[PDB]
Amino acid sequence: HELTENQKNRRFEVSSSLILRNHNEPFLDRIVTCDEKWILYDNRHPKKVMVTIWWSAAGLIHYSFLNPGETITSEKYAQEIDEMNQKLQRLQLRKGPILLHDNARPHVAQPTLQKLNELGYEVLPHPPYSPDLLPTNYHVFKHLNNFLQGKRFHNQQDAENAFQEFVESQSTDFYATGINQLISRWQKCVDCNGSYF
Amino acid sequence: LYFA
Ligand SMILES: [Mg+2]
């Protein structure tokens, strides 16, 4: 993607504001974050399965694979947020969670917005065209790409089993790395006047 | 800390 001037401005504005917010009142520890990815069956039309992973600095919260019958809708994403939140509630056994996710249509439509309001989630400002500011993408997915190269799955189950081994392979500090990098990435974005860095 |  070739950033326009308005897109760089939005990146710069959000970056600068988030760095100051965290300095004023640190909130990284309250972030829950996610993203969707298509996992190809052949990693050397083509079969693929979509995964959604949810996590915080404390660790893996929830992940799910899009199954036959299911549609990628705001209705589905709302049900996923409810399930994720139940798992977070078990795992956290005090300030409310803050969701960082991109502007994919289901993320920003009803009834996703109402679900977030009902469960007590703030949504973090996120600028368009910025996977370099989305930790699931710049951290988890980067390491997952490394892991999948260059495997071959036969079915959806083998693809799931490889994602599982990937997740279970990670050390306890792996997630914290991705989250904590946000400060440095916001700053690099400010340093480059809202461009990529 | 991190998840149990
Ligand atoms: Mg995305």
Residues A166 and A147 sit within 8 Å (Cβ to Cβ): yes
Establish if A177 touches chain B: CB-CB under 8 angstroms. Answer: no
Q: How far is CA A46 from CA A66, A70, A112, in A?
A: 16, 19, 31
CB pair distance less than 8 Å for A60 and B4: no
Residues of A within 8 A of B3 (CB-CB) are 58-60, 91
- Who contacts A124 (Cβ-Cβ below 8 Å, separation ≥6)? A18, A31, A98, A99, A100
Q: Where are the domains of chain A?
A: 1-197
> Annotation-wise, does A173 bind a ligand?
no
Q: State the fold for domain A1-197.
A: Nucleotidyltransferase; domain 5 (3.30.420)
Q: Fill in the DSSP letter of residue A140.
A: I
Give A112's contacts (C-beta < 8 A, 6+ positions apart). Answer: A74, A77, A78, A81, A106
Alpha carbon of B4: minimum distance to chain A alpha carbons (Å): 7
Which residue is it, tokens 């997740």?
A167
Ligand 1 center from residue A102 Cα (angstroms): 6
* Residue B1 C-alpha, separation from nearest chain A C-alpha, in angstroms: 6
Which residues of A, range 6-45, sit inside 8 Å of B by Cβ?
none
Q: Could you report how far apart the first and last alpha carbons of chain A are, in Å?
A: 13
Locate all alpha helices (DSSP H) within chain A, ordered by sequence. 5-24, 74-91, 112-119, 135, 142-148, 156-169, 174-191
Tell whether residue A132 is among the known ligand binding residues: no
Resolution in A: 1.9
CB A37 within 8 A of CB A104: no
Phi, psi of A5 (to 5 degrees): -65, -40
Angle between helices A174-191 and A5-24 (to 10 degrees): 120
List the 1-4 stretch of B: residues with Cβ below 8 A of A. Answer: 1-4
Amino acid identity for residue A45 in this structure? H
**A172 CB contacts (<8 Å, ≥6 apart)?**
A59, B2
Token digits of residue A143: 């390491």
